[model samples]
Target chain A: SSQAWQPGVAMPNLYKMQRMLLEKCDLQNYGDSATLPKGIMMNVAKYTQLCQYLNTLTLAVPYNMRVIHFGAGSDKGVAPGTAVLRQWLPTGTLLVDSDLNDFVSDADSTLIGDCATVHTANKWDLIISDMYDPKTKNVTKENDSKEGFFTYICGFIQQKLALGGSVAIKITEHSWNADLYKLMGHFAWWTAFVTNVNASSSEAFLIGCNYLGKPREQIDGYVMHANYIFWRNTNPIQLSSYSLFDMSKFPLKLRGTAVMSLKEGQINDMILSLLSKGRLIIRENNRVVISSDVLVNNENL
Target chain B: AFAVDAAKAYKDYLASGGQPITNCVKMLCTHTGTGQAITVTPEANMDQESFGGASCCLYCRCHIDHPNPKGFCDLKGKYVQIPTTCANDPVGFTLKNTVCTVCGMWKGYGCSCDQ
Candidate 1:
């Protein structure tokens, strides 16, 4: 069959479809006050609130939540996230602020290292990360890449997240958060959207809850979900809105001629082929499409 | 021809290291932002979508250049086409898929429906 994407296929304008929520990610939006590092050092309570709202979950302290904020800015001697949470959520919340600074003031128990190198024996009920722009602060190593930073974070979620825990990451670029999305799918449920609270205009938030745990994400086994295509795809049973989906029955060759469906490896290769470099047409009979965006835009760019 | 270019770019992407790490923070913005459209090479785009976007284009055909329908490859050198492909036959490759294009389905960010 010709692989041309006929003219009438429907495709979601992700940017357009990703509507901004009415809830502003600023405590200042409501009434709470905090002196933030006007230069993008936004706070936690608001960001966490938005995250919890979007993912439809609660940081119930296991049901005294143990929360930590990576990339917490030490602006004017106070950690932005730490200060905000204190002024808003549980006054007794165990809040730990992390930064690359030699010393993070007005914060409890700090981790002075890059976000990529996280370490801890105890798991967290909530893990909030604020990976900032390397440019604005000139924190560039010239050879450094946030890929591993985000990568390690993905791995961190698999290893450190409590069974029903939640996570919030404000990655300035979705490109850096690409692999992280796949890792989210390994969870029981998750959601993502763009936000511009105290950060540059381009950043987006990836929030997840009810983690089922996967010792470690296969990393390379990630694939595009069909939801991007009927807005989720073909055989979905919709058992729940989120979490790992289960494929029941099948139609391979003809349901009789071949009596099967594409194997896991078969589809993965095809997807990776497209990921590596291949063309995919979803316009013809396709109603909704959630194929990998890497090639969707670059197929021509 | 496009395959060779893509493979080369993929290698270039791998060269940057695993997980598509680049110092550029707004790499996605380059393609979807209202800011000036920047050149996103095929390798660079591959580096962008490593999955869902998991994030990460192509080669050229036409001998010279064509207008009316416009021929180009913005993914590589001069973006006349590769960095961003035109609606018609962006170069000679019969890009039948309409994942992201003006005259296609799926409105990818800034992509207007009818360019």
Candidate 2:
């Protein structure tokens, strides 16, 4: 039976399907065993090989490359596979898997903290952020600036990426916005991908290459701009009885329109969702840089 | 559909001449959805052929002028030169104390230390 994410048709079991992620383990233990459970091995070889191959061809470093995977999971629905990645690591490379949760694995190093607030002095060649709540969820208390990952993310990439480095992040469609377009435009070349290979997700990857701008300027610009928008554009910000910087209380509803702009652009900017029927586009200034017609979300396994 | 053999894909990636590694972004992109509720080898299926050749991305090690230079995967990027040296600093990598130094070798340009 199929599931329904549609309105007006209240069909039960619309999204009833398998969710176990299926992945193959073929990493030869010239370092570790190739027989780890799928939960501990999904995308391990896929990325290690990417790094290992890049090390030889493009990123030819004498020392082992340095890789930091942020929000690396550890739970029934999540996999903190970086420890096993050590085996797949090319001789001199380093791997560190991080998360706020406590779990055990053989990862070269573990930094326990929210990927957003945490920082390491290491300038990395590759930074992978696999952050997402595992419960079919992306909704969280707004700005948690009061949703703070992207702000720090821009800061992290700008400060920590090796000069000609790259960043690969898993972002759900709802989070795609103009600020993302600005960030991508800062890089020389960036691509957003939607794949159907995942047995249970529509979350896509935005891999940006060779960042090409002043890191601090862009980072500062975004934070200031977001504050300006939130203060002036939205309704009055009243202090919650809790007295915290209570921002938007609900999930910021995303729209399918193409009318958002910065500075000269008007008010009422909207974030986009992958499920929107209209073409999903990320624009800079006024031109469109990335757009998707349909996201191949395997709601059912 | 491209071949699923990792080695073959790598060869095709090379033999086709090193193009910018952009294909990976759209390799599995489909307007219509697939890859659900299918039965296959239980070992999981990650290390086969999706990347080694079809959409292999070697990161941003290409030349600036020729951001799309052949040899890297299909991704597009400028080759920013690594620094020559750095001030004493750096990582929570291992507990080991590290001094200031970082560098990676590129295609035409060998190594530029002092990062």
Measured by lDDT, the strongest candidate is: 1
Q: What DockQ, on C-alphas, does every prediction get? A: 0.01, 0.02
lDDT of 2 by residue, A107-143 (tens): 4455666665465644665577766655433344342
lDDT of 1: 0.36
Compared with the true structure, all predictions reach lDDT values of: 0.36, 0.34
For model 1 the TM-score comes to: 0.39
Off by over 4 Å in 2: A1-62, A77-80, A83-88, A134-146, A176-178, A215-301, B1-115
Query: How does model 2 fare in lDDT?
Result: 0.34
CAPRI band of model 2?
incorrect
Off by over 4 Å in 1: A1-60, A75-77, A103-106, A136-146, A196-200, A215-301, B1-115
